[PDB]
């Protein structure tokens, strides 16, 4: 609710979206979602980056991946690890619904 959105569109689909906080008129970066789609144009990733003002950069955090079965979508959640420099799966949180 204290948040402001700007979306980047390419060929009808949002490839990215940026979320800011606003002190008055000045916007300050907060989170950035980078999205990927398949050929059928359904969403496949949703990488969630956080703004680290003090290092002044976008830092990898969470990433969700969607899989479409014929009766079922499966969503898997990954967390970024610095020391490995990889998005690691948290299978504990995986969900499968119809």
From TrEMBL:
<keyword id="KW-0732">Signal</keyword>
<protein>
    <recommendedName>
        <fullName>DUF3836 domain-containing protein</fullName>
    </recommendedName>
</protein>
